[PDB]
Amino acid sequence: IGKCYIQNRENGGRAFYNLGRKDLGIFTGKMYDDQIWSFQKSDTPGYYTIGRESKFLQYNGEQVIMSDIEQDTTLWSLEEVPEDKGFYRLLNKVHKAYLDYNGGDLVANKHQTESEKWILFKAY
Amino acid sequence: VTIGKCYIQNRENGGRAFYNLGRKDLGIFTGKMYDDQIWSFQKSDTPGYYTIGRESKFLQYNGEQVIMSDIEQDTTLWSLEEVPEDKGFYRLLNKVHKAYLDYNGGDLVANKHQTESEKWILFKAY
Ligand SMILES: [Cl-]
Ligand SMILES: [Cl-]
């Protein structure tokens, strides 16, 4: 909870949002400050928002994007992965799809795949 | 300042220190997050210093190479130094040899001069 990095088990890459070029993605390598997110509990029990730069990570059924608006599609639940203690899938409430990656892009996927396992750890 | 099970990850490349007992393999890895990257960070017998342990062994520096130790020798004692412009990151300073935990390629090394590759974040594994 609070400021955190969001790192993928499969490749060690971290989600980032760069406001200076409006670039959302996943990056493997150096730990830049645009990889630091605000992970906050939402109004609805069991659901969270993932935010940077006054925007929220959302999935609109077509793309994973950043939203200025705290709307339904910004709600995510954590889903335990028993084989990998400390890792979670991030499941979008509205569209029931998992946060995933394809190359350097964040995507959503209803299938359960090895690239959907994330660890959220304190930035400071 | 995490105490207990943690990953030890480098700011410069996102790589994680690891020790695999079966393969007797110590290094840093920039790919997938495996179980053997989870360390036990504990307070030592001497205040101000910590041990860094896996598989009933301890990370040490003997003045030549960074290696594991079966026993908590003086060479297994490390202090934390905050990195001035990177809150959450630390240099790990070996007590006996005054050398900072560092890396070169896939290997852990130690260096007495402060450099850009010595910044570690120690984050809870669970
Ligand atoms: Cl960018
Ligand atoms: Cl980045």
d(CA A29, CA A48): 27
Burial group, residue B32, by CB count within 10 angstroms (0-12, 13-18, 19+)? middle
Neighbours of A113 (CB within 10 A): 12
Statement: B4-124 belongs to CATH 3.30.1330.60? no
Give the residues across from B20 on adjacent strands.
Answer: B25
Give the SS3 label for residue A35. Answer: helix
Neighbours of B9 (CB within 10 A): 25
Q: Which long-range contacts (CB under 8 A, 24 or more apart) does B56-62 make?
A: B57/B19, B57/B21, B59/B17, B59/B19, B59/B26, B60/B94, B61/B94, B61/B96, B61/B97, B61/B99, B61/B101, B61/B110, B62/B97
Tokens encoding A115: 């690239």
d(CA B2, CA A27): 25
Among the bound ligands, name the one nearest to the CA of residue A32.
Answer: 2
B73–chain A nearest CA distance, Å:
30
d(CA B35, CA A86): 11
- Residue written as token pair 């490349």: B13
Q: Are strands B16-20 and B25-29 parallel, antiparallel or unpaired?
A: antiparallel
Tokens encoding A12: 């060690």
Give residue limits of the domains in chain A.
Answer: 5-121
Give the SS3 label for residue A114. Answer: helix
Test the A interface: residue of B10, B123, B124 with most A CBs within 10 Å: B123
Q: How far is the CA of B70 from the centre of ligand 2 (A)?
A: 39
Contact A99, A113 (CB under 8 A): no
Q: Amino acid identity of A42?
A: S
d(CA B117, CA B108): 11
Q: Amino acid identity of A90?
A: L
Q: Residue A122's closest CA among B101, B50, B87?
A: B87
- Compare all CA atoms of chain B with the CA of A5 and give the residue at the minimum distance: B123
| Residue B34: φ, ψ to 5° | -95, 160
For chain B, how many residues are written?
A: 126
Contact B89, B119 (CB under 8 A): yes
Residues 4-23 of B with CB under 8 A from A: 7, 9, 11-16
Domain A5-121 class?
mainly beta
A122 contacts in B (CB within 8 Å)? 88, 123-124
d(CA B53, CA B4): 10
Q: Residue B118's closest CA among B10, B46, B1?
A: B10
* Chain B contact present for A89, CB below 8 A: no
Contact A31, A65 (CB under 8 A): no
* Chain B contact present for A46, CB below 8 A: no
Rg (CA), chain A: 13
Q: Residue A87's closest CA among A111, A70, A112?
A: A112
A31 contacts in B (CB within 8 Å)? 9, 11-12, 14, 121
Q: How far is the CA of A20 from the centre of ligand 2 (A)?
A: 12
d(CA B52, CA B108): 13
Tokens encoding B99: 């050398």
Rg (CA), chain B: 13
* Chain A contact present for B47, CB below 8 A: no
Q: How far is the CA of A21 from the centre of ligand 2 (A)?
A: 11
Contact A37, A76 (CB under 8 A): no
Residues 92-111 of A with CB under 8 A from B: none
Task: Calculate the CA B103 to chain-centre distance.
Answer: 10
Verify whether the Cβ–Cβ distance A29 to B14 is below 8 Å. Answer: yes
